[PDB]
Structure formats: structure tokens, C-alpha cells
Amino acid sequence: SGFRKMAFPSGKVEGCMVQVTCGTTTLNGLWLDDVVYCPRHVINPNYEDLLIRKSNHNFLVQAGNVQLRVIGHSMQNCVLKLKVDTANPKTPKYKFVRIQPGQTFSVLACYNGSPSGVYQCAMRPNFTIKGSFLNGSCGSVGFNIDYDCVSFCYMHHMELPTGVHAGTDLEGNFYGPFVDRQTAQAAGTDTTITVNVLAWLYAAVINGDRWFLNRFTTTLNDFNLVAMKYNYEPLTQDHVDILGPLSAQTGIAVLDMCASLKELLQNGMNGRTILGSALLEDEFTPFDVVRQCSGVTF
Amino acid sequence: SGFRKMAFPSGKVEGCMVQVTCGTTTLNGLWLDDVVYCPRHVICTSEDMLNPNYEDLLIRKSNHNFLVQAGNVQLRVIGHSMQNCVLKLKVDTANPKTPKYKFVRIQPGQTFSVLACYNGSPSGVYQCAMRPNFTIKGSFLNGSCGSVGFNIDYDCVSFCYMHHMELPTGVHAGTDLEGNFYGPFVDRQTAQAAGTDTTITVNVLAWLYAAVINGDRWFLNRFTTTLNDFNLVAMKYNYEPLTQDHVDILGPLSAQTGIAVLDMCASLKELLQNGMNGRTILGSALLEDEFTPFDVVRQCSG
Ligand SMILES: C=CC(=O)NC[C@@]1(C(=O)Nc2cncc3ccccc23)CCOc2ccc(Cl)cc21
Numbered sequence: 001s002g003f004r005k006m007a008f009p010s011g012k013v014e015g016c017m018v019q020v021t022c023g024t025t026t027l028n029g030l031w032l033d034d035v036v037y038c039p040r041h042v043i044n045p046n047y048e049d050l051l052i053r054k055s056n057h058n059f060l061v062q063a064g065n066v067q068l069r070v071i072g073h074s075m076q077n078c079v080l081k082l083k084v085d086t087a088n089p090k091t092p093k094y095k096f097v098r099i100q101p102g103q104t105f106s107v108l109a110c111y112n113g114s115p116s117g118v119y120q121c122a123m124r125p126n127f128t129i130k131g132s133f134l135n136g137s138c139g140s141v142g143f144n145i146d147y148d149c150v151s152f153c154y155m156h157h158m159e160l161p162t163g164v165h166a167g168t169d170l171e172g173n174f175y176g177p178f179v180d181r182q183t184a185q186a187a188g189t190d191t192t193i194t195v196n197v198l199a200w201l202y203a204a205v206i207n208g209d210r211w212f213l214n215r216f217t218t219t220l221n222d223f224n225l226v227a228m229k230y231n232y233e234p235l236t237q238d239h240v241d242i243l244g245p246l247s248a249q250t251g252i253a254v255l256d257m258c259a260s261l262k263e264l265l266q267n268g269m270n271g272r273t274i275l276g277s278a279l280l281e282d283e284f285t286p287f288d289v290v291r292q293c294s295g296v297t298f
Numbered sequence: 299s300g301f302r303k304m305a306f307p308s309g310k311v312e313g314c315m316v317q318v319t320c321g322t323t324t325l326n327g328l329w330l331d332d333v334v335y336c337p338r339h340v341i342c343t344s345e346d347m348l349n350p351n352y353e354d355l356l357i358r359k360s361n362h363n364f365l366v367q368a369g370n371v372q373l374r375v376i377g378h379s380m381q382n383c384v385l386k387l388k389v390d391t392a393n394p395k396t397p398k399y400k401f402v403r404i405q406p407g408q409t410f411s412v413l414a415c416y417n418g419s420p421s422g423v424y425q426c427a428m429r430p431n432f433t434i435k436g437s438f439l440n441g442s443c444g445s446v447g448f449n450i451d452y453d454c455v456s457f458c459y460m461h462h463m464e465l466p467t468g469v470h471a472g473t474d475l476e477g478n479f480y481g482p483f484v485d486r487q488t489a490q491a492a493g494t495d496t497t498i499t500v501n502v503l504a505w506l507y508a509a510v511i512n513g514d515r516w517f518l519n520r521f522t523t524t525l526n527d528f529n530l531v532a533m534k535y536n537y538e539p540l541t542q543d544h545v546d547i548l549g550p551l552s553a554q555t556g557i558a559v560l561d562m563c564a565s566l567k568e569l570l571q572n573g574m575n576g577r578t579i580l581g582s583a584l585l586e587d588e589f590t591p592f593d594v595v596r597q598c599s600g
């Protein structure tokens with residue numbers, strides 16, 4: 001029993017965190033094999049013009065108490081790739097993957113190439129992440145683990161005026177309509193991840209909470225009209241299929257659980273909580289619920 | 299900006315997790331130097347758990363009865379002893395990944411990270427608090443016994459908790475790393491129940507100071523309160539009594555935001571009376587009590 005916001009064990013990623021300094025800017029880098037990846041803003045900016053004026057020795061890379069020597073550099077989208085003389089002996093098995101909004105991942109927040117914390121978060125439908133970062137956190141990374149393979153999906157670049165965060169995949173492509181430049185940028189209107197709230201409702205039933213269940217069902221279309229009224233993401237047939245295992249485990253059909261969600265949106269919780277929360281939680285995917293309620297190890 | 303329930307990076311602890319098997323029972327162990335620490339109930343059967351005599355069960359065991367696995371390598375047990383509710387297995391290899399560490403016993407209200415493991419393999423990390431009734435609201439399944447709680451301040455790992463059991467309400471009970479249980483709990487399958495839980499007042503105040511630091515002041519009011527009047531109101535909502543030590547501990551946060559501790563207490567009294575009225579504080583509709591004054595300073599201020 002219990003249901004917590006759980007992050008993946010961070011050890012495989014801790015062994016890759018380095019400090020990258022160029023002039024007056026210091027941020028974090030990801031050292032995998034003989035390459036260090038970091039945000040290109042470490043160097044209205046013209047990044048080809050700023051980079052062409054740099055030599056290899058202008059980049060100071062620190063791995064613990066050891067300086068790494070930069071032997072080459074190149075830019076891929078908004079990520080700077082620093083070729084170093086030493087391959088990281090702690091390099092885990094890894095992939096670079098681009099995630100979709102609604103997907104979750106662990107973030108290892110770092111300052112000066114030193115990991116300070118780990119938390120679980122979700123890519124919001126508006127492509128921002130509600131993270132917890134301070135100045136010097138740039139270059140901190142987001143990941144998932146599957147078996148022994150680390151899939152790197154996020155690199156932190158900036159904070160928006162509302163306190164939320166924006167970054168890229170590990171190939172330097174931003175998530176969302178953002179640019180790596182000090183200019184007026186704002187997060188779009190956010191929406192709730194419907195498939196994730198339903199998954200968390202199934203997790204509450206598995207942990208013995210059934211007060212919100214009702215005898216009713218709904219059509220997908222009628223549910224989608226109601227959910228669009230409450231700034232919830234549209235629920236597709238793919239979402240309904242993905243919730244199949246949880247529906248079969250609890251005996252509550254997805255559209256039956258949707259009718260419970262409609263009643264919660266129209267009437268509230270009435271002084272009650274679900275898994276110790278007075279709000280409907282949307283940062284656990286159907287897979288996170290299955291993994292936590294089964295004990296999958298890495 | 300932002301405020302998340304943050305756990306410590308778990309790598310230093312992952313390198314210590316091993317699998318311990320005795321007969322049909324398999325659980326997790328903590329391998330530090332040449333010793334593996336694990337719950338002593340690894341020597342029990344299900345027909346033993348009601349009234350186990352651990353000294354009698356242990357005296358019948360030899361070193362080779364304990365199978366210890368570190369990854370894909372079997373460790374050789376060369377000695378064994380019991381310290382309170384922890385079994386200490388001396389092994390023939392010192393852990394090369396042993397970090398700098400301390401064993402610390404924490405007080406209720408203190409927080410820590412838990413690395414949940416199954417079969418000596420880490421599956422997840424989360425942040426938790428020792429509740430006033432000495433239980434933890436964790437996320438544990440069968441086979442997670444031996445999972446540990448820790449804090450990593452500087453490069454030193456302070457081990458404060460080892461998981462032993464789940465109580466009937468779904469909450470968890472365990473020991474410090476010297477085998478002394480937190481609370482009035484025993485490692486027996488006897489009828490045990492957690493005492494009535496209460497809210498950690500000093501932690502809610504710390505989280506209210508964290509909200510002010512992040513730019514949220516809607517909940518503040520023009521009132522102050524005496525410590526006694528605050529405790530007479532707080533006890534009625536099942537909040538822990540706030541002591542002069544708690545008021546002293548909140549000093550730095552009070553000085554940083556300019557809000558006196560007893561003025562923040564008056565705001566807490568009003569929140570308890572009014573509720574939030576559709577508003578949130580740091581993305582939450584409930585008053586959060588699992589961040590200590592120290593966690594707030596660490597996260598909001600670096
Ligand atoms: C051979 C021994 C043994 O398997 N012991 C573990 C046990 C336990 O609580 N386990 C579990 C821990 N954590 C989470 C759980 C979730 C779901 C089921 C079991 C969970 C089970 C029985 O009741 C007791 C009673 C006392 C003690 Cl110390 C331990 C236990």
C-alpha cells in the first residue's frame with residue numbers, strides 16, 4: 001500500500017553530470033562517451049557567430065575534481081556538443097528520446113555539475129514543465145529507465161515569467177514554441193491530462209478508495225464535451241485502449257471511470273480526498289500506475 | 299521558482315543494495331564496508347511471525363544458511379549477529395561502492411528519501427516524513443522490507459530508516475539502522491495499530507514561508523497570536539503543539555520574509571478556519587506538512 005510521486009533511481013545519470021564554464025556562464029553538462037552535451041546559451045544572439053569566435057580551451061569542463069580537456073565542438077539545434085579526450089567510464093546504456101505532452105520523467109536537478117535532488121514531473125500539454133529550478137540549474141536533465149537503458153528526454157534551458165520551465169530534447173529541439181533568447185515569451189493556457197487523471201483514479205481504487213465510483217457509464221463523445229468545458233485534454237480511443245489493463249484489473253470499464261470523473265468535475269470532492277489529495281492528480285501515466293502497483297526494478 | 303517534493307539523488311545508496319535470502323524469505327539488505335544490515339525477520343516463517351523467539355531461531359542458523367547477492371555476484375557470509383531488530387551479516391568482501399556514511403536516529407516531523415527495492419534491485423525513489431505517530435506514509439509492496447530511508451547532506455549519507463512492516467491502515471513501520479523501532483511497534487504479526495495521526499505544524503509553517511518566498515501572500519492577515527492561543531486553536535484541528543524550539547527554528551525564514559513566526563501562526567489559524575476558497579498554495583489545495591524548515595531553505599534558497 002501507498003501511492004507516492006516516485007522518480008527513477010538517479011545513479012546512472014549522476015555518473016554523467018559535469019560542470020561546463022565558458023567565460024562568466026556556468027551550467028551543467030551531460031557527459032556520455034567522449035561528448036559533453038549542454039545548452040548552447042553557455043556561450044538577440046547569433047550562435048554561429050558566437051561559436052566561431054571560441055576555441056576548445058575557452059570551455060572548462062569539470063567532472064568531480066578532474067578537469068576534462070575539450071578537443072572539439074559542434075552545435076546541434078539548441079545543444080552544444082563538446083568533444084572531450086576522455087570517454088566517460090560511467091556511461092550507462094542509453095538512448096535519446098523525444099517525449100509527448102502527458103508523458104512523465106525524472107529530473108536530476110544539478111548546480112555546478114553536482115546533483116542536488118531528484119523529482120518526478122510531466123510534460124504539460126502546453127509543453128512546459130512545473131519543475132523546481134534555481135539559477136545555475138541549466139543543463140539539468142530529464143530521463144526514464146527501461147530495464148538498464150536510460151532514455152534521456154529533456155535538458156533544462158530556461159524559466160518562464162510564471163515560474164514554469166522550458167527546455168529541449170537531447171538533440172536540441174525545444175519542447176513547445178520557445179526560443180533560447182532573452183525575449184518576451186509566455187506559456188500557453190494549460191490543460192489537464194485526462195488519461196493521467198483516469199489512471200490515478202484507477203490507482204486510488206487499487207489502494208482501497210471507491211467513494212467516487214458510481215453505477216453510471218458515458219459515451220466517449222459525451223465525456224469529451226464535458227471535459228472540454230473543464231479545460232481537460234480530449235480523451236481518444238488510444239487513451240481508452242491504454243487504460244485496458246487497469247480497467248480489467250479493477251472491473252471498472254474506462255467509460256464507467258469517465259462517468260465518475262464527470263461527476264467529480266461537476267460536483268467537486270465535497271470535503272473528501274483521493275490518495276491524500278483534494279485536487280485531481282494528472283502527473284501519473286497509466287504505465288506509472290502499473291509499475292508502482294507491481295514493483296518493477298532497475 | 300517552483301516547489302516540488304524533492305528526494306536526494308539515490309546513487310550513493312543504490313551501490314549498497316543487496317538481496318538477502320534465508321530459506322524461503324527474500325528481502326533487501328544494506329551492504330556497507332564488510333557488513334550487510336537487514337531486518338531480523340528474514341530468519342522467520344509465516345508460522346513464526348505471531349510470537350517469534352529470534353534468539354532461538356538465530357542460534358539454529360549457520361553462516362552458509364544466509365544467501366547474499368550483490369548484482370550477479372554471491373557474497374560469502376563469514377559471521378552474523380543481532381542488534382535489536384537488525385541482523386548484521388559479516389561478509390568476506392568490503393563494498394567498494396561504500397559511500398561516506400553515518401547512522402542517525404530521526405525525530406517525528408523530520409523528512410528523508412526512500413529508495414524502494416525488491417530482490418536487492420532499486421525500483422524508485424520518493425520523499426517521506428516520519429509522522430508524529432512514528433509511522434511513514436510510504437509506497438511499499440511485499441518484498442520491499444530492508445528498503446532504506448536517508449538524507450545526503452554534503453557528500454555524506456545519513457541512514458535513518460530501514461523498512462520492516464506494513465500496518466493494517468496501509469502505513470509503514472521500521473527501525474533506525476541500529477534496529478530500534480520508531481514508535482511502539484514490534485516485529486511481530488500481533489494486532490498493532492498506529493496511534494491517531496496529527497499534522498506537523500512546524501512543517502506547515504515552513505511551507506507557508508516557502509509560498510511567501512515564491513511570491514504568494516493571499517493567506518496572510520493583519521493579526522498576530524500568542525503561542526498558547528495558537529496551540530489551543532491548532533489542537534482542535536489535530537495539529538501538533540508548536541513549541542518554543544519550533545519558533546526558534548523558524549527564525550531564519552521569518553527574517554528572510556519579514557513575517558514574524560506568530561504572525562505566520564495567525565495566518566495558519568485563519569486558513570484552518572476558512573479553508574482555501576478555491577485557491578491553492580504552491581500548487582496544493584491542502585496544507586502541506588512534509589517539508590521541514592531545513593528543506594525549505596535548501597530548495598528555495600540553494
Ligand atoms: C516472513 C516475514 C515477512 O514476510 N514479514 C513481512 C510482513 C510485512 O509487513 N510485509 C510488508 C511490508 N511492506 C509492505 C507490505 C505490503 C503488502 C504486504 C506486506 C508488506 C508481512 C506480515 O506481517 C508482518 C508483521 C511484522 C513484520 Cl516486522 C513484518 C511483516
Ligand SMILES: [Cl-]
Pocket residue numbers: 403404405408
Ligand atoms: Cl531529526
